[PDB]
Structure formats: structure tokens, C-alpha cells
Amino acid sequence: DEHKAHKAILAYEKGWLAFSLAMLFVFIALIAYTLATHTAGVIPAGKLERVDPTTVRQEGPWADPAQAVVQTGPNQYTVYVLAFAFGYQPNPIEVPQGAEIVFKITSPDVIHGFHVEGTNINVEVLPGEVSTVRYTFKRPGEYRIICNQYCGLGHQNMFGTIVVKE
Amino acid sequence: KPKGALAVILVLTLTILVFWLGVYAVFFARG
Amino acid sequence: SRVYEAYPEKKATLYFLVLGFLALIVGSLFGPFQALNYGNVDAYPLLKRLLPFVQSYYQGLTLHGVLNAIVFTQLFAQAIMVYLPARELNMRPNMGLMWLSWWMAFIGLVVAALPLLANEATVLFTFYPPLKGHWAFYLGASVFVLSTWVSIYIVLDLWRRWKAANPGKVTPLVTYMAVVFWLMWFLASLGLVLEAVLFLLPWSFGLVEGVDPLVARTLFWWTGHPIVYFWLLPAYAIIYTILPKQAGGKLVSDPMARLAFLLFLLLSTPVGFHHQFADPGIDPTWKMIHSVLTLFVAVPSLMTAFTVAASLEFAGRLRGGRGLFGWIRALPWDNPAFVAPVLGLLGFIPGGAGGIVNASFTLDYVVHNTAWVPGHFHLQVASLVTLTAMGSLYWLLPNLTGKPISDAQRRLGLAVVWLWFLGMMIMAVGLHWAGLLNVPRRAYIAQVPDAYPHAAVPMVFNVLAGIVLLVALLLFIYGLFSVLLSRERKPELAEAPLPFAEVISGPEDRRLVLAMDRIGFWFAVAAILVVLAYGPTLVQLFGHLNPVPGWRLW
Ligand code: HAS
Ligand code: HEM
Ligand SMILES: CCCCCCCC/C=C/CCCCCCCC(=O)OC[C@H](O)CO
Ligand SMILES: CCCCCCCC/C=C\CCCCCCCC(=O)OC[C@H](O)CO
Ligand SMILES: CCCCCCCC/C=C\CCCCCCCC(=O)OC[C@H](O)CO
Ligand SMILES: CCCCCCCC/C=C\CCCCCCCC(=O)OC[C@H](O)CO
Ligand SMILES: CCCCCCCC/C=C\CCCCCCCC(=O)OC[C@H](O)CO
Ligand SMILES: CCCCCCCC/C=C\CCCCCCCC(=O)OC[C@H](O)CO
Ligand SMILES: CCCCCCCC/C=C\CCCCCCCC(=O)OC[C@H](O)CO
Ligand SMILES: CCCCCCCC/C=C\CCCCCCCC(=O)OC[C@H](O)CO
Ligand code: CUA
Ligand SMILES: [O-][O-]
Ligand SMILES: [Cu+2]
């Protein structure tokens, strides 16, 4: 009874442990796959790229928001975004559909979120560093940017806007 | 066999699969 | 009391427990309001009448998080993971050192609380730079956490003292748990200590102008994840070594339990990049590695799930349950100390399911920093851990005080537990669901009542859960003090034995157990795994530090 119950319990637990490991392994295969698609573009570039938050609004590519959007490939735009208290420049961000948008985002004060609603763009923006991420917008229109890292009392109302043109 | 113990891990597997496959779908819908 | 003369550890532990729950109660005051907030209902005016020192949503969120997630959980781990091994071994923990650790905690908590209550430290319980709190927040946090180093010394001391009296015996179960537990905590603590000492404290005392945000976040999440396993394993010690008795059965595998724990010693610390998936300056290959390491650490619980469920079933069968379902209804559902953990395990199923989602590298972009994440962790720590600690009142309080639980007090206990479970369940749905709708975490969203229209449905869950938990919390308060400040005191309770379970017969893997008891060796493996997992990244970060001015934006 107890000797038996124990034997059967331990046999089957080993069944479970093998199947679960299996399932974990498959998830790993499925994550890997995503790494090989274009959907991995939203993973940040893990290169260090250091800036000076104290001068970033005075010099460099964040200094003049109406020139944040540069064509860097025959189908590619780099966009220099400032995330700051409490908003995003430029507002709006204007990019064309179909084109690969490299976002290079930074902050002059504290940390912010950059979460593009409707998309997989979700990146922490740290002052002193440039966060780089890649997305292609397939559908034209208006995406909301949401800040999703607490950044002080203005956190709940800090929003931005990406317009994707036809 | 431990019939009940297995029911538990059935539910747990199903919960996990639903969660993970769910969010996988979402990830790709947004990709 | 003669009893306290012979067992002064009962009184220290009692002190750790009460402070923990006080911290719990105070911290938890803010929860219903936060729940109503995530339901788009602003009750903060009401709160600021009752509690006029409270200046904002985010000051309350700081108190809430610091007090529930850091203070109460740690006090609890210190209570359980000293006293349990100490009773198993029937040995006296170093009483001088035990009191040093309680006063360390108490002192540190009070120092950190001063600037928290005064609105000088409204950074969250994560306190990411460059948001800059008062030096007293960092000092008192630092001293609060370091209290655990004393704890670590204590249980190692017990351990060795025992091994000396008992050479060529294996380490007993609860004590093997507690030892791998505390050794795990020491590695993991290093990250934060490092961050506080190299960075947070210099900075906040004014010794250096800036801190590198990336390096602080990396060092934070070194400690930052295994701190949750620090929270969890005290509960698991009870679920494994006590609950089986409460449920009418036995623990069905000593070695399986030891293995769960050992896996936690190895796999708890090298994983922290699963909090930095959306961070710059961390290589994607290292994120994949930590992602894989994170899927592994989910194994000890996948394991726990079977071991524990099987134990529960064995109990229900002993108690007459027939059928695929009948072993469930056969269990002691009128016993709060049984119900609380079991309900917590139930919620743990969707909890861990969301953890597993979070840990997948790219899948985290769906949910990162949305209400989903609070959804995940209220199932894990606000439910399973808190419910466990809660139901231990009904067995561990009497044991420490001689104070009896009336039948009336038992019934109130069931009500609280269930209402807490259910409330947490209802909230988990509103949160996950809102998260999938892109609602951010850490946000006073009722103050932007038109910002999240697509979330109307889950919001009503958050409201409901809000009022349901308010009632549960009220009832918990009433009840705790009803038992704490109670008249009767039967000392033959304090002298009763803790309800440790037996282990089921029979034969086992003696060589497995023996391998696992090579604890020095596993300690170093674990530590190598950290150097390997964190070393190369940290060497680059440190080699390219870019400090920034701190800010106060509240
Ligand atoms: C106690 C507290 C904690 C536990 C436990 C916990 C478990 C997990 N977590 Fe987590 N979590 C993450 C990964 C996981 C995974 C893989 C697991 C796993 O360990 C889960 C394993 C568990 C299982 C696979 C389930 C087994 C089921 C059991 C054991 C119950 C069986 C039931 C029985 C036997 C009862 C039956 C009885 C009857 C009556 C029938 C990640 C990412 O990889 C993030 C960051 C995401 C982001 O974007 O920030 C995160 C963030 C959080 C945060 C917020 C951090 C912050 O504030 O920024 C907190 C505090 C937290 C808490 C906790 N976490 N987690
Ligand atoms: C009456 C029960 C409680 C309620 C209704 C409740 C509700 C909430 C809600 C709605 C939030 C999200 C607020 C936001 O994201 O802005 C939250 C956050 C939090 N909760 Fe609780 N809570 C409860 C108890 C607990 C307990 C027992 C724990 C710890 C054991 C806990 C740990 C936390 C922490 C760590 C935070 C996150 C703080 C941060 O992100 O800075 N909660 N809770
Ligand atoms: C054991 C404790 C569990 C707690 C369970 C309690 C039941 C929940 C509510 C029941 C009545 C339904 C309430 C609906 C009536 C008014 C709602 C309304 O219209 O909202 C007012 C206003 O919008 C706000 O600011
Ligand atoms: C997508 C896949 C579909 C998902 C659908 C849910 C899958 C159920 C999962 C695990 C059951 C684990 C238990 C496996 C039992 C192992 C058999 C065993 O070890 O039995 C030995 C015993 O001695 C014999 O007499
Ligand atoms: C005992 C049985 C042994 C065999 C067990 C095998 C388990 C196979 C399970 C999953 C395979 C994953 C397939 C990987 C394909 C992923 C591609 C995908 O999902 O693509 C959607 C998206 O639209 C594209 O861009
Ligand atoms: C019990 C739990 C129940 C949970 C129930 C889950 C409900 C959430 C479902 C899907 C969200 C997926 C997100 C898909 C986002 C699409 C939005 C979009 O594409 O629109 C933006 C764009 O700018 C237009 O121009
Ligand atoms: C008892 C408390 C438990 C709390 C339970 C938490 C609720 C979350 C459950 C499942 C999420 C599954 C993912 C949902 C997927 C829905 C959308 C989908 O399937 O994705 C395709 C869609 O087109 C994309 O826009
Ligand atoms: C939307 C979420 C809100 C709803 C949340 C629901 C989640 C699960 C609820 C209860 C689990 C109950 C499990 C089985 C309970 C056993 C009680 C039992 O069998 O009772 C015996 C009786 O006392 C004779 O002795
Ligand atoms: C044992 C303790 C209890 C554990 C059991 C709880 C596990 C929850 C699992 C799934 C619930 C998710 C609800 C189903 C998801 C709905 C999907 C949906 O309709 O999503 C919208 C989509 O876009 C189409 O319109
Ligand atoms: C007596 C024990 C069982 C009773 C338990 C109740 C059953 C749960 C059902 C609904 C909860 C309703 C709570 C929500 C009421 C708040 C009103 C609100 O916020 O309504 C939002 C609406 O969408 C405005 O536009
Ligand atoms: Cu910027 Cu929150
Ligand atoms: O913390 O997961
Ligand atoms: Cu973690």
C-alpha cells in the first residue's frame, strides 16, 4: 500500500518531469524561431552607445526634432526620439508605411517607457544610453506611444504619437 | 497510478499551453 | 514565562512574525485603492482624509511595494527559515545573534520609513536611478536587508554544530532546505549590496554626482529575481514539511523535495536578464542564455507541483476519498492552515503560467511593464506566499505564544483566506486582461479616465476585487488582533510539537540524497554559474560607466 503508492507516485512523477522538460524545450525552439524572423527587430541592440543627457537637447540628433527622421536606407528611416518629462519629441513621429524604422531613443532626465500600442515595440529608455529598435509598420495610421516605466508624478499622462502614412 | 496528481498537472499543462500559445499568437499579430 | 526561558527562539520568531504582519497590514491598506485605480475609480481623496501624510498615488505604491514585497516577506522568511530547522534539530539557535538580526531589521525599517512617510523617497520598491531618494531610504533598506546575513550565519551555525555531533549522518530535511535556502540568498544578495555600497549610498550622501542607470539596473536584478525565491521557499518549506500532516497524509518523497530545493540553489541567481529584456546595452545572446536558464528554474516548481499534489492526494485517500475527485473533498477544508496554502497553490497554476510567458525573450515585449506583470506576481507572492504565512497563524501562533484559537476564530480564518484567495483571483483576471490591452503598470490611470476605453470590462474586475479584498483585509486585521491580544493562554500549546509530516515508505535513493548533501560543492557550482552568467556582461558595463545626474520628480 504505502510501499506501492510510493513506487507508483515516483514512476509517474518521472513521466511528468520528462514531458514538462520537453514542453520547456519546445518553447525554447519556438523562441529561437522568433529570433530568426523580422519580428526580432524589437529586441534592443545590445551595443553600448553612450550620450550626455545634459547636452542632448542642445547638440546632436535629438536637438532639432523636426529633423529626427532621416532616410538611412533605400527603404529605411532612422528616427531620433527624445523621451522626457513628460512627453516624446517629435510629436508626432511621421514615418511611411512599409519602411523599416530604426528607432534610436534616449532621455535627458529619468527613465521612461517607449511602448508603441498595437505593436511589439517595448523598450526601456535610459538617460546616458541610446536604445535602438527596429519595426516595420504594415498598417497606416495613428499609434499611441505609452510610457510604462514610472517616471514621477507625470507618469500617468505621458503619451506620444506615431503617424504611419499611406 | 496517482490519478488525482495527474489531473492537477493536466490542468497545469493546459493552463501553461493556453497562456504561452495565446501570447505567442498575440506577439505575431503585433509583429 | 518558563517556556521562553527554555525556548527563547520562540520569542524572537514571534517578533519577526508580528513586525512582518504589521508591515503587511500597513502596506496592504494601499491595495484596495490601487485596485480601484486599475478599475478606473479614483478613491484617493477618501484615502488622503484618513491618511493625510500621503501625498500621491506613487508614494502609496512605494509604501505598498516596500512594505509587502520587501519587509513582510523577509521578516517571514527569517521567522520560518530559522525556527523550523531549529525545532527539527531540537537545538538552540545563537540567541545573541538572533536578537541582533531582529533589531537590525527593526532599526533599518524605521530609518527607511522616515523618508518614505515624509515623501522624500517616492521611488518604487525598485528605486531605479536616476530617480533619487533620501539617503535614509538607502541606508535603512541596506541595513534591513543585511539583517539576513546574520540569519545566514545562524542557520549555518546550527547546521555545523549538528554535523559535529552527528558525523556521517545526512542533513535532515527542513535543515537541508534551510541551508541551501540561505546559501542561495547570500549569492543573490550580493548584487544589491554591491549596488547600494558602490553606487546608491555614495550618490545619496552626495559623494558622487551621478549613477549609471544600466549598471544599477543590472546589479539590482542580480538580487532582484532570486529575491522572489527567497520569498517563496519559506512557504515551500511549510507546503512540503508541514501541510502534508495538516492534510491528513505524509510527504511522499524526501529526495524529490531535496532536489527541488537544490535546483533552487543552482538556478535562482544566474537569470536576472529576464527583467532586462527591454534594456539597451545588454547583448541579445546573453538575454537568450538567461531566458533558457529561466525556463530551467521553472522546473523545481513543475516538480513541486507533482510532489505536493501527490502528497495531497495520498492524504485524501487515507481520509476515505474515492474517485478521481473524491480525494479533494476528503481533505480538511474546515482547517484554515490547510486551506490557505492549498488555495495559494491553486492560483499558483496561472501564476507560473504567466511567469513562463514572461521568461520567453521576445514574448516579454507583449507584456513588459503592463498590468499583466502585477497580474503574474499577485498570484505568486500576494497569494501563495501571503496565504501560506496567513494560515500558519492558526498553527504557529499557538506554538509560539500558548494562545489558543477559538472555534469562532477558526471560522473567521476560513472566511479571510477564501475572500483573500478569491479577491486575488478576480484581480488576476482584470490585470492580465488589462495588460493584454496595453494598460501600463505603476500608473494612476483613474486620473486619465478616457485613456483606456478598450479596458472597460477587466476594469470592473479590478473594482470588484478592490472591495472584496478590502473586506478580507479588514477581517484579517480584526482577527489577527483578536487572537494576538486574546485573554486565555494555555502553555501546553507552546510546548506542543510543530506538526511536521512523516515521509512515506519506502525505499529511496540514498546515493542521490548523499550527493545532494555535498553542500559546499553545490554552493560553489551555484557561484560559478553566477560568474559565468553575469561576469562578462558586468565587466563591460563597469569598463564603460556613464553616470548621470539624479532627479526628484514628485
Ligand atoms: C513569489 C514571487 C515570485 C514567483 C514565484 C515568481 C515566479 C516566476 N516568475 Fe515572476 N516574473 C518572471 C519569471 C517568472 C517565472 C518563470 C516564474 C516561475 O518560477 C514559475 C514556476 C511555477 C510553475 C511552473 C507552476 C507550478 C505550480 C504549482 C507548484 C502549483 C500546483 C498546485 C497544487 C499542487 C495544488 C493542488 C491541490 C488541489 C486541491 C487539487 C519574469 C520574466 O522572466 C518577470 C519579468 C517580466 C517583465 O516584463 O517584467 C517576472 C516579474 C515578477 C515580479 C515583478 C518584478 C518587478 O517588479 O519589476 C515579481 C515581484 C514576481 C514575483 C515572483 N515570480 N515576478
Ligand atoms: C489587499 C491586497 C492587495 C491588493 C488589492 C493589491 C493590489 C495591487 C495592485 C492593483 C497593484 C498595481 C498598482 C500599479 O501597478 O500601479 C499592486 C502592486 C504591487 N503589489 Fe499589491 N495588493 C495586495 C496585496 C499585496 C501583497 C500581499 C503583495 C506582497 C506580498 C503585494 C505586492 C505588490 C508589489 C510588489 C507591487 C508593485 C509595486 C511597484 O510596481 O512598484 N501586493 N497591488
Ligand atoms: C465579502 C465581501 C465581498 C464584496 C462583494 C460586495 C458586492 C459588490 C457590489 C454589490 C452591489 C453592486 C454595486 C453596484 C451599485 C452602484 C455602482 C455604481 O453605479 O457606481 C457608483 C459610482 O460610479 C462610483 O464612483
Ligand atoms: C501539445 C501536447 C498535448 C497536450 C495534452 C496534455 C498532455 C499531458 C501531459 C503530461 C502527462 C504526464 C504523465 C505521463 C505519464 C508517463 C508514464 C509513466 O511514466 O508511467 C510509468 C508507470 O510505471 C506505468 O505503469
Ligand atoms: C513525440 C513527438 C516528437 C516530435 C515533437 C515535435 C514538436 C513540434 C512542436 C512545435 C514545432 C514548432 C514549429 C516551428 C515553426 C514556427 C513558425 C511559426 O509559428 O510561424 C508563425 C509566423 O506567422 C511566422 O512568421
Ligand atoms: C481570461 C482572460 C481573457 C483575456 C481576453 C484577451 C483579450 C485581448 C485580445 C487581444 C489583444 C491583442 C492585441 C492586438 C492589437 C491590435 C491593435 C491594432 O492593430 O491597432 C492599432 C493601429 O494603430 C490601428 O491603426
Ligand atoms: C484564476 C485567475 C487566473 C487569471 C487568468 C489570466 C488570464 C489570461 C489567460 C490567458 C491568456 C491567453 C492569451 C490570450 C490570447 C487572446 C488573443 C489571441 O488568441 O491572439 C490573436 C489576436 O488576433 C491578437 O491580436
Ligand atoms: C474569475 C475567478 C473568480 C472565481 C475563482 C475560482 C477559482 C477556483 C475557486 C475555488 C477552488 C475550489 C477547489 C475545490 C474546493 C474544495 C472544497 C470542497 O471540496 O469542500 C468539501 C466540503 O467542505 C465537505 O467536506
Ligand atoms: C487550477 C486553478 C485554475 C486554473 C485555470 C485557469 C487557467 C486560465 C486559462 C485560460 C483562461 C483564458 C480565457 C480564454 C482566452 C480568451 C481568448 C479570446 O477570446 O481573446 C480574444 C481574441 O482576440 C478573440 O477575439
Ligand atoms: C453578495 C455576494 C456576491 C456579490 C458580489 C457582486 C457580484 C460580482 C458582479 C459585479 C460586481 C460589480 C462591482 C462593480 C461596480 C462598480 C461600478 C463601476 O465601476 O462600473 C463601471 C462601468 O463600466 C461604468 O461605465
Ligand atoms: Cu515617462 Cu512614465
Ligand atoms: O521575479 O520573477
Ligand atoms: Cu525574475
Q: How far apart are CA C459 and CA C465, in angstroms?
A: 10
Contacting residues for C113 by C-beta, under 8 A, at least 6 apart? C140
Pairwise CA distance, residues C266 & C525, whole Å:
7
Q: Which residues pair with A89 in a beta bridge?
A: A82
With left for phi above 0 and alpha for psi between -120 and 50, is residue C442 left, alpha or beta? left
How many Å apart are CA C469 and CA C476, to the nearest integer? 10
Do A56 and A89 belong together in one domain? yes
Domain with C476 in it: 1-554
CA torsion through residues C236, C237, C239, C240, sign: positive
Q: Catalytic residue at C376?
A: yes
Give the separation between CA C345 and CA A114, rounded to whole angstroms.
35
Of all atoms in ligand 7, which is nearest to the CA of residue B22?
A: 13
Q: Give the number of other Cβ atoms within 10 Å of residue A18's Cβ.
A: 10
Does any ligand 6 atom lie closer than 6 A to the CB of residue A141? yes
Q: Ligand 6 in contact with B29 (CB < 6 A)?
A: yes
**Which residues have any ligand 1 atom within 6 Å of their CB?**
B 8, 12; C 126, 228, 231-232, 274-275, 294, 297-298, 301-302, 304-305, 308-309, 312, 328, 342, 345-346, 348-349, 352, 355-356, 358-359, 364, 367-368, 373, 376-377, 380-381, 385
CB spacing of A9 vs B16 below 8 angstroms: no
Residues C163, C166: Cα–Cα separation, whole Å? 5
Residue A36 shares a structural domain with residue A55:
no
Ligand in closest contact with the CA of C428: 7
Residues in chain C, overall count: 554
C-alpha A142/C-alpha A117 separation (Å) is 10
Please check whether residue C264 is in contact with residue C297, taking contact to mean a CB–CB distance below 8 angstroms: yes
Q: How far apart are CA C530 and CA C544, in angstroms?
A: 21
Cα–Cα dist C440/C373, whole Å: 9
Helix (H) or strand (E) holding C548: strand C548-549
Q: Check CB contact of C305 with chain B, cutoff 8 Å.
A: yes
Q: What is the CATH number of the domain that holds C322?
A: 1.20.210.10
Beta bridge partners of A70: A78
Domain hosting A1: range is 1-44
What is the H or E stretch that residue C554 is in? none
Q: Is C378 annotated as contributing to ligand binding?
A: yes
> What's the rounded Cα separation, in Å, for the pair C72 and C62?
14
User: How far, in Å, are A77, B1, C90, C330, C417 from residue C334 at the CA level?
Assistant: 65, 28, 31, 11, 11
* Amino acid at the residue C135: W
Cβ contact B6–A16 (<8 Å): yes
Q: Which of C220, C216, C104, C196 is nearest to C152 (CA)?
A: C104
A145 backbone dihedrals φ, ψ, rounded to 5°: -90, 135
Whether residue A109 sits in one domain with residue A29: no
Joined together, the cell numbers standing for residue C544 give: 564603460
Backbone φ and ψ of C128, nearest 5°: -70, 130
Both A82 and A95 in a single domain? Answer: yes
Q: Which of A25, A84, A103, A159 is catalytic?
A: A84
Is the minimum CB–CB distance between C539 and chain A shorter than 8 Å?
no
- Separation between Cα atoms, residue C248 and residue C311, nearest integer Å: 10
**Residue A118: left (phi > 0), alpha (psi -120 to 50), or beta?**
left
Query: What is the C-alpha separation between C240 and C545, in angstroms, rounded?
Result: 45
CATH assignment of the domain containing A20: 1.20.1070.10
8 A C-beta contact, residue C462 and residue C35: yes
Q: Are A5 and A77 members of one domain?
A: no
Residue C398 CA to residue C409 CA, distance in Å, equals 12
Q: Which of A138, A164, A166 shows the shortest CA–CA distance to A69? A: A164
The enclosing domain of A133 has a CATH number of 2.60.40.420
Per-residue cell: C516? 545532494
Residue with cell 512599409: A98
Return the closest-CA partner of residue C152 out of C232, C235, C230, C261. C230
How far apart are alpha carbons B31 and C380 in whole angstroms? 30
All three cell numbers of C152, joined, read 545566514
Task: Tell me the residues surrounding ligand 13 (ion) with CB < 5 Å.
Answer: C 225
Q: From the candidates C294, C537, C551, which should be mutated to test the interface with A, based on the most A CB atoms within 10 A?
A: C551
Q: How far apart are CA C200 and CA C140, in angstroms?
A: 12
Domain count for chain A, please give it: 2
Number of independent structural domains in chain C? 1
Distance separating alpha carbons of residues A39 and A135, to the nearest angstrom: 8
Give the helix ranges, DSSP H, for C383-505.
Answer: 386-391, 393-401, 407-436, 456-484, 491-494
CA atoms of C261 and C232, how far apart (whole Å): 11
Chain-centroid distance, C-alpha A140: 20
> Which distant-in-sequence residues (6+ apart) come within 8 Å of C184 by Cβ?
C226, C229, C230, C233, C264, C265, C268, C269, C526
Cβ burial, residue C511 (10 Å; 0-12/13-18/19+)? exposed
Residue A12 to residue B6, Cβ atoms within 8 A: yes
Asked whether residue A55 falls in the same domain as residue A89, the answer is yes
Q: Which amino acid is at A68?
A: A
Method for this entry: X-ray
Helix (H) or strand (E) holding C549: strand C548-549
Strand partners, A164: A95, A141
Using an 8 Å Cβ cutoff, are C233 and C76 in contact? no
Q: Is A159 a catalytic residue?
A: no
Q: Radius of gyration (Cα) for chain A, nearest Å? A: 22
Q: Give the one of A13, A35, A157 whose C-beta lies nearest to C256's C-beta.
A: A13
User: What's the CA-to-centroid distance between C276 and ligand 6, angstroms?
Assistant: 24
**Cα–Cα dist C476/C550, whole Å:** 40
C-alpha pair distances (Å), A125 with each of A43, A90, A104, C358: 13, 16, 10, 20
DSSP per position, chain A: -HHHHHHHHHHHHHHHHHHHHHHHHHHHHHHHHHHHSGGGGGSPP-S--B--TTTTTTSSTTS-GGG-EEEEETTEEEEEEEEETTEEESSSEEEETTSEEEEEEE-SSS-EEEEETTSS-EEEE-TTB-EEEEEE--S-EEEEEE--S--STTGGG-EEEEEEE-
The x, y and z cell numbers of residue C4, run together, are 521562553
Residue A62's closest CA among A84, A43, A85? A84
Rounded to whole angstroms, the Cα distance separating A27 from C355 reads: 13
Q: Are C122 and C62 in contact (CB under 8 A)?
A: yes
Residues of A in contact with B13 (CB under 8 A): 19-20, 23
Determine the 3-state secondary structure of B13 from DSSP. Answer: helix
* A98 Rama class: left (phi>0) / alpha (psi -120 to 50) / beta: left
Residue C211 is classified by DSSP as: E
* CA–CA separation, A155 and C9 (whole Å): 46
Q: Count other C-beta atoms under 10 Å from residue C1's C-beta.
A: 13
Catalytic residue among C72, C441, C461, C534: C441
Dihedral sign of CA atoms C524, C529, C530, C534 in order: positive
β-pairing, A93-96 with A159-165?
parallel
Same-domain pairing of A133 and A148: yes
E-only strand ranges, C127-224: 210-211
SS3 state of residue C147: helix
* Interchain pair B4, C327: CB under 8 A: yes
The answer for C131, left when phi > 0, alpha when psi is -120 to 50, beta otherwise, is beta
What DSSP character marks residue C296? H
CB of C59 within 6 A of ligand 2: the answer is no
Cα(C286)–Cα(C537) distance, integer angstroms = 8
- DSSP code, position C11: H
Same domain, A125 and A52: yes
What residues have CB less than 8 Å from C142, skipping those under 6 apart? C108, C193, C196, C197, C200, C201
Query: In the numeric block, which cell numbers belong to residue C361?
Result: 525573450
Cα of C350 vs centre of ligand 7, distance in Å, is 11
How far apart (Å, rounded) are the C-alpha atoms in residues C357 and C372? 11
Mark which residues 1-31 of B lie under 8 Å from A by CB: 1-2, 5-6, 9, 13, 16-17, 20, 24, 27-28, 30-31
Mutate to test the interface with B, among C317, C366, C368, C504 (most CBs of B within 10 A): C366
- Please give the helix or strand (H or E) that residue C305 lies within, else none: helix C299-318
Chain A closest CA to C311's CA: distance in Å? 9
For residue C121, the surrounding DSSP H or E stretch is none
Run of H or E including C132? none
What does the alpha-carbon distance between residue A118 and residue C253 come to, in Å, rounded to a whole number?
A: 48
